[PDB]
Amino acid sequence: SMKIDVVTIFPEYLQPVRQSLIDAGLVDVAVHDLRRWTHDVHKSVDDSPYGGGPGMVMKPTVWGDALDEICTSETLLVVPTPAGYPFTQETAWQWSTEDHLVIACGRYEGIDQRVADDAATRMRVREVSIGDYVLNGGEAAALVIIEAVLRLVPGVLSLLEGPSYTRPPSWRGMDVPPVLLSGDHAKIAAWRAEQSRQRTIERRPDLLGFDS
């Protein structure tokens, strides 16, 4: 059993998770509007940065009140950010056995650093990046993290994968590799091992300890 809470100023962006990645009852996912923890009539969640810079920063006060209500000492607080530790398959396996994830989604130029720092005095906190590109906010990263983690949960139970094929054996004058039709398990395993190592050196040489 896992519970996931997502906090955001754009709750509508999280609807793609509504169609189960939940239907079984293994996991429960809930989405919260950050603005519900404001108190002024304009529901202001942002202010200009100290020390200069472009754009706006999310205020710590509103975030602190939201996390106070949602989190406990058992919670793993997840904060997507381009400046984070890398989120990898290893991370996904680690988080797949957690009881409670809370994902805090930033907008504007980001969240006041004291939010994560205050939270770390009460619970475990992980600032993470899902890849070396920049988004407008954390919501799409939240969807990626939820999908990668939930598929590993017990109950929903290196090198690059090579190419796959299915019927018909000839299509537009292009043939499925004959070894794959041969029924020879040893030869098929060897061919697939070689396609994978060939794809890896071409596309991801870093995975085998080479440059670029």
Q: Is 210 in the site for its own copies (CB under 8 A)?
A: no
**Footprint of its own copies on residues 49-108 (CB under 8 A)?**
49-53, 56-61, 64, 82-89, 91-92
Q: Is 112 in the site for its own copies (CB under 8 A)?
A: yes
Dist. CA 204–CA 153, nearest whole Å:
28
Of 112, 37, 123, give the one whose Cα is nearest residue 78: 123
Determine whether 141 is exposed, middle or buried from the number of CB atoms within 10 Å of its CB (0-12, 13-18, 19+): buried
Dist. CA 130–CA 68, nearest whole Å:
26
CB 4 within 8 A of CB 28: yes
Nearer to ligand 6SD, 114 or 187 (CB): 114
- Report what 138 binds from ligand 6SD, its own copies, none; CB cut-off 5-8 Å by kind: ligand 6SD
Residues that bind ligand 6SD (CB under 6 A): 80-82, 106-108, 110, 129-131, 133-135, 137-138, 141
Q: Is 164 in the site for its own copies (CB under 8 A)?
A: yes
Q: Is 9 in the site for its own copies (CB under 8 A)?
A: no
Nearest approach, Cβ of residue 92 and ligand 6SD (Å): 10
Of 87, 77, 94, give the one whose Cα is nearest residue 152: 94
Q: Is 186 in the site for its own copies (CB under 8 A)?
A: no
Dist. CA 46–CA 60, nearest whole Å:
9
Binding site per annotation, positions for S-adenosyl-L-methionine:
80, 106, 129-135
Nearest approach, Cβ of residue 202 and its own copies (Å): 9
Binding site per annotation, positions for adenine:
130-131, 133, 135
CB 170 within 8 A of CB 122: no
CA distances from 63 to 34, 99, 138, 145, 156 (A): 7, 22, 14, 21, 33
* Chain residue whose CB lies nearest ligand 6SD: 106
- Report what 80 binds from ligand 6SD, its own copies, none; CB cut-off 5-8 Å by kind: ligand 6SD
Q: Is 135 in the site for its own copies (CB under 8 A)?
A: yes
